[PDB]
Amino acid sequence: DSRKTYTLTDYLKNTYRLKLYSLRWISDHEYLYKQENNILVFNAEYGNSSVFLENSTFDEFGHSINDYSISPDGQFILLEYNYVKQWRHSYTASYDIYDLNKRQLITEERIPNNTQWVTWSPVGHKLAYVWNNDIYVKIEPNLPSYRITWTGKEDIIYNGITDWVYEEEVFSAYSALWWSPNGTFLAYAQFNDTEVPLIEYSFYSDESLQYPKTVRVPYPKAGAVNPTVKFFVVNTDSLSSVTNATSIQITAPASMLIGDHYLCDVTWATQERISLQWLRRIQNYSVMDICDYDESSGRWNCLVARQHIEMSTTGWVGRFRPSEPHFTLDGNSFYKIISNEEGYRHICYFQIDKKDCTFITKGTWEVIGIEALTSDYLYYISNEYKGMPGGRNLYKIQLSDYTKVTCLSCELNPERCQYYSVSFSKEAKYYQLRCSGPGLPLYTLHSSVNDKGLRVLEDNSALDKMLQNVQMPSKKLDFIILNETKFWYQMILPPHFDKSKKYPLLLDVYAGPCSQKADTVFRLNWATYLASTENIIVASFDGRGSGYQGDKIMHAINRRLGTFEVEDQIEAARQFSKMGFVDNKRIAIWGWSYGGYVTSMVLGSGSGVFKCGIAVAPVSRWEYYDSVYTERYMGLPTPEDNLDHYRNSTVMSRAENFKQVEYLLIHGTADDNVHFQQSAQISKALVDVGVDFQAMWYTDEDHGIASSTAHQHIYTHMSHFIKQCFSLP
Amino acid sequence: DSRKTYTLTDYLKNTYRLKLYSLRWISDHEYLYKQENNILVFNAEYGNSSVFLENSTFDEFGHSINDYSISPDGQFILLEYNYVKQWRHSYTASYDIYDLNKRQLITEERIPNNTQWVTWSPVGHKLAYVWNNDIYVKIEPNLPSYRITWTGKEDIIYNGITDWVYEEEVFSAYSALWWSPNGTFLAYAQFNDTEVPLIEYSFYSDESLQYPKTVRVPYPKAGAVNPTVKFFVVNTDSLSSVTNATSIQITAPASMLIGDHYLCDVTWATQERISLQWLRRIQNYSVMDICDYDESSGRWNCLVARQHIEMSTTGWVGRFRPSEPHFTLDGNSFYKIISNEEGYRHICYFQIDKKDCTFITKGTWEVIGIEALTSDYLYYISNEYKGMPGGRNLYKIQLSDYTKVTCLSCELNPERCQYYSVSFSKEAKYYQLRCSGPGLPLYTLHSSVNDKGLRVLEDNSALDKMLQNVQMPSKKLDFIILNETKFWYQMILPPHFDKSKKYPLLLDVYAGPCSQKADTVFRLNWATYLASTENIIVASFDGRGSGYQGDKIMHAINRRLGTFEVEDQIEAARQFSKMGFVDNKRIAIWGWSYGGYVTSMVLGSGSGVFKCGIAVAPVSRWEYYDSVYTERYMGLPTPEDNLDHYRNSTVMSRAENFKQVEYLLIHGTADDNVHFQQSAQISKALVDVGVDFQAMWYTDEDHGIASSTAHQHIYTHMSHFIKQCFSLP
Numbered sequence A, B: 001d002s003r004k005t006y007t008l009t010d011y012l013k014n015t016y017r018l019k020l021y022s023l024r025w026i027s028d029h030e031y032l033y034k035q036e037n038n039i040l041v042f043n044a045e046y047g048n049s050s051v052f053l054e055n056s057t058f059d060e061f062g063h064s065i066n067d068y069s070i071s072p073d074g075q076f077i078l079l080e081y082n083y084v085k086q087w088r089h090s091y092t093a094s095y096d097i098y099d100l101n102k103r104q105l106i107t108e109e110r111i112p113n114n115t116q117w118v119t120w121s122p123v124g125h126k127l128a129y130v131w132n133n134d135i136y137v138k139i140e141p142n143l144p145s146y147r148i149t150w151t152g153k154e155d156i157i158y159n160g161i162t163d164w165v166y167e168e169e170v171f172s173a174y175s176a177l178w179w180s181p182n183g184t185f186l187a188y189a190q191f192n193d194t195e196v197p198l199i200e201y202s203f204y205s206d207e208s209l210q211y212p213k214t215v216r217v218p219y220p221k222a223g224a225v226n227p228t229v230k231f232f233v234v235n236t237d238s239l240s241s242v243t244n245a246t247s248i249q250i251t252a253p254a255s256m257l258i259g260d261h262y263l264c265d266v267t268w269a270t271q272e273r274i275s276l277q278w279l280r281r282i283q284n285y286s287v288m289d290i291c292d293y294d295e296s297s298g299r300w301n302c303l304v305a306r307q308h309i310e311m312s313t314t315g316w317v318g319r320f321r322p323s324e325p326h327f328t329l330d331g332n333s334f335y336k337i338i339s340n341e342e343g344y345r346h347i348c349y350f351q352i353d354k355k356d357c358t359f360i361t362k363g364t365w366e367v368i369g370i371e372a373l374t375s376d377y378l379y380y381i382s383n384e385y386k387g388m389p390g391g392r393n394l395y396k397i398q399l400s401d402y403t404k405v406t407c408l409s410c411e412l413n414p415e416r417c418q419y420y421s422v423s424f425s426k427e428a429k430y431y432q433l434r435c436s437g438p439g440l441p442l443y444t445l446h447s448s449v450n451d452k453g454l455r456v457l458e459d460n461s462a463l464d465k466m467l468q469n470v471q472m473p474s475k476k477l478d479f480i481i482l483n484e485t486k487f488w489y490q491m492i493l494p495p496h497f498d499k500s501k502k503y504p505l506l507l508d509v510y511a512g513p514c515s516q517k518a519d520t521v522f523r524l525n526w527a528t529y530l531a532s533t534e535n536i537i538v539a540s541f542d543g544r545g546s547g548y549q550g551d552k553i554m555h556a557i558n559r560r561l562g563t564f565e566v567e568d569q570i571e572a573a574r575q576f577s578k579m580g581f582v583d584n585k586r587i588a589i590w591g592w593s594y595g596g597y598v599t600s601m602v603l604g605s606g607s608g609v610f611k612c613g614i615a616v617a618p619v620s621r622w623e624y625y626d627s628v629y630t631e632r633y634m635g636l637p638t639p640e641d642n643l644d645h646y647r648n649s650t651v652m653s654r655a656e657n658f659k660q661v662e663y664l665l666i667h668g669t670a671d672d673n674v675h676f677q678q679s680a681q682i683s684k685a686l687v688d689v690g691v692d693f694q695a696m697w698y699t700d701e702d703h704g705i706a707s708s709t710a711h712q713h714i715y716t717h718m719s720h721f722i723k724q725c726f727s728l729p
């Protein structure tokens, strides 16, 4: 063979690029799509377009525009710029509104600078924005704001936005406001961080800064004091008629009030009915309230007959958070994903005043998500097809006859596409299918009335052509058996793979609870280069604790992080050698984040299986990590709860066993999530026992080490180390 | 040759220890010596001893005593324990006092815990001590203490102790207390750091600390707000237990009060005469005031007729600060090292009320220090012997005839001993010589009356014969010519050095202003292992800006740090590489601190001479370093002064050029001196141009990376690096 391989320059410089089809549905019939930096509107039924916004229109705006969003009624567009990333989801920016009718910018009563979030009402053109930790509402883009809260206080009181931990762990989103479905009410959460301890780290900034600055974030580590939360609803329709419109509190149930708790879900049901879920600090008990506006009293009431209680015997509640409800039009019933009697996650259907739900799906497989609900159908993604827990397909269940279930995606192109996501139009008339593997991604448009394919949106044939002429790795997804249970693994295999030759193996690890590293997604990444150019088999493996294959497996690491998930990676490696195509002298392991911890635990296990390993931004001790995530899996680090296992599960306690391996440790200094602290303590421990290792810090990089230069630097650095570890003299 | 080499373990585990003989003169006739934990008193004339303190006297004391300090009159002993390091000289400790007459510990009115500094008066047994930034005085060990200052305040107001920058740079000590020669008066300085910005960094502590802490130190960076200082004198003979102490302030001369300035020297002349020097923040103007106590007034008066002005046109004043005066018995005249007209540092004789001084020494060589003064002789150390700048000998000059100069150490043992330091008895009747090279250290005792050599104190006999069984490297000290100027170098040469063989070379750099790395001192260090086990030549070179050779060379880097001193190392290496025994393909460079800065600048120079190098705790940008040190050499970083060269002289600007070399960058996270920031900015810059390098941070280590485990770990890592850099294909 004489075609070039997939090299590291190829990966780092993005020579081979995936084409996407990111559309935004503006109605049941139309979607927006960015083409040549023009923004086009598409008729779904026929596939014709017009230009919605010409690429010339903001030439003389004077600012690089970061993003855009159109009022639901089409009359205005919101423009975002001066974007500066905050955490994983949060950022600040400047904003302006362009009147789409008048074809004019709006210059009075403008959204202030340094605004933290902004949302259109779901209908019409109301705006809700958060500035200086307070909520404000405009009825019309050009009119003065109404202030909603007066309590905003930097790092202390958050109205309508999350604090660090609620952003990262609880909502995995920044905003904490929820418009009612026709824009009348605005629901919002308020977070109090007064007694939450601060993480403190240096930020060095450009070299022109003489003194480093101290970044200080309220961040509760395990067992520490948590933010408290309150919930409010204001009637925005009365702001123009009243001076200071009252924010009506809905208090948490008495069974949450008895101690530390969380607000873990907000979902509107109807115009006058909202639902909330709370979760005790011990994350095995949740309560859903369903609350109705009492018109004559102006107050919200949650009838105890409508409360629903979820609880767990074998582990925590939900995959990561208690699962969200989906309401039928009338708000009298709802669908929720919950773990059945066998431990598998399936769709359960509730009436709002009955506690017992009815299961509409079942089997040894799981529903991944509920994607849309019409009067006749519920659409959902699952891994049912062919018993492949790492597969994804779109299903449709007939509401009047549960035995009538159609796979809408399975057989469309079943050699090329086993992993789907979906985007439904506003009332589910159309759906876009997004196939992400095991062949090249494919984007298709479908009409829901007949379930027929309307046209191919993006098929990536341009790329396929280029890839024909490159020695690509292949991928093997399969299982092995242990104690009579299936555990999946995938392998990125060098081109011309030969079962008779002996290959070096790199074990790629994440292995956190409900993770999945063995799937059917097509990826171009570092592993691609390693299999293609360096002839390394890159393996991953879903051992105990992993997701989408049921509770028996997922909860097996309940309260016991740093055990089975760790042993099973080692076991995985023993089984690859046993396959006879793996050089037992050249087994490596590497992981980022949770994977950094597992890699490190495996390297300090004293197993003899691995020659070397790389840990990037690892957890090193569970007490250093955040309360919400750590406590969900570990409980509390108190003598009466689970301290023994917190202390027994640190990387540092294994320092002496790192004498047997070559170790590369890497961490960004401004990592606000897994604090440099945690690698500072691994390195100190290794020094203390006289172990030599390799280290790299990334100045002002966070958990993602995602900046362009640093991204390339870290994969270059790691490549040398892998090659060095494997080099044969 | 079947003998072992001096290995890396040998260096790190101190297999071969230099024996010393540290004594403390107590009179003109006797000294103390710590022998097998016992304290012995020696009579100098005869060499006989008695036991002063038996080691077992405190067997059941409670804690391990860190240090002892006997009152000058021999009645009491101060016991130091609970020693906790602060900066380079500062610490806190606890203290108890033992009465040698009553043979019992004092239990009444003990010195408080966390005492910052304590000192006996130079006669008798008074005590002055600092606690919570205030000065206290005990006339008797058991008597209640009088409080002298009430202004003391953490990180803000310092009485009788220094702030960070005065400790490190100005006094190079922590005390700011000066007893008068018979203990009547106590002179002290007060520092005010109110507007001095804080350096902040993380400290991680032991594993069990859940949240890292932020250390905050008042530290002025180049051009920032400096501390302000005041000077006071209190009569301790007139204290009341009923009235607050009265401190008489001596204000600085008007020509210092016009702007930012420093207090740089305090030296008592008599019982009632004290001298101070003040230095302008632009450190090329200093003035000495001489102030007499006015028995009528109770005030101290500094007659302008007694003011002494010192200035430099080519650089700064004094080697690092203006030199100390050595007064005669009556205090009417004094001796002081100042730069002569040829820019060589020589002894000048001053009358207290006359502007001009008289140089009593002269020549193209320099006086290192004045060590002792009698009515007949001044004893000094100089580098005159054989015009060797890196050698050190003891001389006496006859005060009535300056032509009568006698060398007291030159001829004692020329082959073994070319580097001396001395220690005189109280009245200069006896002196100790410490020879420390080029052969093994040798300690001897002498009498001044006829310069008889009484006896050998310690000759390092054991070690000598130990070393005979090891393949010890040799040291070569020589010079090269650059523009008709002699510049010196040293090479640590491997055993059995073979000039027809080609050796790899490591350039060991410091190169700071007034530095000296080519000398005759005998050292057992990293370079020793390198030459002996690894057969690497380790060279050091003293180029422009190096000290002890006149201001023509020392001042060449004035306002121009990171130029000639960097250029000169490259040229040295260049020249070394053209010698026949140097492998021009294997030349490395390393430095710590200022040498880390030079190493990095050299590596970024684009010279092509060096294949690899190591920088430990380097300065990277002069604006990050402290004011006193940096401004002395660079002036102010304003466009009206020397900003451009502050910006021309960064490691960061040279990042591109690292592309062609292998670089290891190492720094401790708790470095209060050269802040981690300096390396964080280096790392970021290399990341930004795409240059691979190696790195190592040391959690909670400071500038010395000196804790036993970190020490062994750093040298282990560096050894691995150098060996890898020097391996052939």
Ligand SMILES: Cc1cc(N2CCN([C@@H]3CN[C@H](C(=O)N4CCSC4)C3)CC2)n(-c2ccccc2)n1
Binding pocket: A168, A169, A170, A171, A172, A320, A321, A512, A593, A594, A619, A625, A629, A673, A674
């Ligand atoms: C399919 C999916 C994945 C996740 N998450 C997002 C949060 N994520 C954690 C956020 N912080 C954690 C983290 O960063 N570490 C944990 C231990 S090592 C570092 C992961 C796990 C996956 N969510 C989710 C979780 C909570 C609310 C909504 C969605 N849903």
Ligand SMILES: Cc1cc(N2CCN([C@@H]3CN[C@H](C(=O)N4CCSC4)C3)CC2)n(-c2ccccc2)n1
Binding pocket: B168, B169, B170, B171, B172, B320, B321, B512, B593, B594, B619, B629, B673, B674
């Ligand atoms: C023979 C000698 C050496 C020094 N010094 C001590 C202080 N030292 C500086 C203290 N901080 C500096 C430092 O640590 N860096 C400077 C450049 S990189 C880091 C060195 C230089 C030599 N002194 C001295 C200086 C001032 C007062 C009294 C004595 N005398």
Ligand SMILES: *[C@@H]1O[C@H](CO)[C@@H](O[C@@H]2O[C@H](CO)[C@@H](O)[C@H](O)[C@H]2NC(C)=O)[C@H](O)[C@H]1NC(C)=O
Binding pocket: A149, A150, A151, A244
């Ligand atoms: C709108 O109403 C709120 C609540 O009634 C007012 O906020 C209160 O103001 C008082 C005194 O200023 C504080 O002591 C209370 O704690 C505040 N309560 C809350 C919930 O913030 C607010 O001032 C009103 N706004 C206007 C413009 O009148």
Ligand SMILES: *[C@@H]1O[C@H](CO)[C@@H](O[C@@H]2O[C@H](CO)[C@@H](O)[C@H](O)[C@H]2NC(C)=O)[C@H](O)[C@H]1NC(C)=O
Binding pocket: A151, A157, A192, A193, A194, A195
């Ligand atoms: C956020 O929480 C703190 C308590 O954790 C509240 O602060 C207290 O407020 C009362 C007045 O109602 C004071 O008397 C207390 O002394 C305060 N305690 C502390 C610890 O500061 C604060 O009001 C809360 N903020 C809200 C709800 O906006």
Ligand SMILES: *[C@@H]1O[C@H](CO)[C@@H](O[C@@H]2O[C@H](CO)[C@@H](O)[C@H](O)[C@H]2NC(C)=O)[C@H](O)[C@H]1NC(C)=O
Binding pocket: A182, A183, A184, A235, A237, A271, A272
């Ligand atoms: C959105 O839903 C709200 C909530 O029901 C509607 O507000 C009510 O409108 C009816 C008119 O039929 C009145 O009887 C009630 O007094 C209103 N209640 C409140 C609290 O405002 C609102 O009309 C709907 N808005 C739109 C645009 O359809």
Ligand SMILES: *[C@@H]1O[C@H](CO)[C@@H](O[C@@H]2O[C@H](CO)[C@@H](O)[C@H](O)[C@H]2NC(C)=O)[C@H](O)[C@H]1NC(C)=O
Binding pocket: B151, B157, B192, B193, B194, B195
């Ligand atoms: C230490 O210095 C600060 C100034 O740096 C002094 O504070 C000033 O005090 C004067 C008189 O009391 C006031 O007029 C100023 O407003 C203060 N300035 C600032 C910036 O605080 C402080 O008093 C000094 N302390 C001592 C003991 O000398």
Ligand SMILES: *[C@@H]1O[C@H](CO)[C@@H](O[C@@H]2O[C@H](CO)[C@@H](O)[C@H](O)[C@H]2NC(C)=O)[C@H](O)[C@H]1NC(C)=O
Binding pocket: B182, B183, B184, B237, B271, B272, B295
């Ligand atoms: C140390 O020297 C001081 C300063 O001269 C002595 O104090 C003076 O002593 C004389 C007698 O010799 C008295 O007439 C003065 O009134 C004293 N002056 C002051 C300012 O106190 C002191 O006696 C000496 N101290 C010791 C312990 O010998």
Ligand SMILES: *[C@@H]1O[C@H](CO)[C@@H](O)[C@H](O)[C@H]1NC(C)=O
Binding pocket: A036, A037, A038, A055, A056
């Ligand atoms: C703007 O619009 C047209 C697409 O029809 C094209 O000429 C141009 O490439 C577009 N893109 C720009 C100006 O970035």
Ligand SMILES: *[C@@H]1O[C@H](CO)[C@@H](O)[C@H](O)[C@H]1NC(C)=O
Binding pocket: A041, A042, A043, A046, A048, A049, A050
């Ligand atoms: C697409 O074509 C139809 C005609 O069949 C027309 O009515 C519709 O408005 C067109 N839509 C767009 C977005 O161009």
Ligand SMILES: *[C@@H]1O[C@H](CO)[C@@H](O)[C@H](O)[C@H]1NC(C)=O
Binding pocket: A282, A284, A311, A312, A313, A635
């Ligand atoms: C929730 O967890 C705690 C401790 O793990 C346990 O004692 C409690 O009974 C649990 N609740 C349920 C319903 O199992």
Ligand SMILES: *[C@@H]1O[C@H](CO)[C@@H](O)[C@H](O)[C@H]1NC(C)=O
Binding pocket: B041, B042, B043, B046, B048, B049, B050
């Ligand atoms: C040394 O010897 C002399 C006797 O000649 C004696 O007086 C003196 O006290 C002795 N000194 C010591 C320190 O033991």
Ligand SMILES: *[C@@H]1O[C@H](CO)[C@@H](O)[C@H](O)[C@H]1NC(C)=O
Binding pocket: B110, B111, B112, B113
């Ligand atoms: C220092 O602390 C110890 C133990 O806490 C205490 O017993 C002792 O009295 C203290 N020392 C002084 C001088 O107060």
Ligand SMILES: *[C@@H]1O[C@H](CO)[C@@H](O)[C@H](O)[C@H]1NC(C)=O
Binding pocket: B150, B242, B243, B244
């Ligand atoms: C001495 O002065 C200080 C501060 O000025 C004051 O706090 C203290 O009360 C005074 N004490 C006496 C006894 O005068």
Ligand SMILES: *[C@@H]1O[C@H](CO)[C@@H](O)[C@H](O)[C@H]1NC(C)=O
Binding pocket: B282, B284, B285, B311, B312, B313, B635
């Ligand atoms: C001190 O240095 C400055 C700045 O280079 C210079 O202008 C001046 O001549 C010097 N001061 C004296 C008193 O020589």
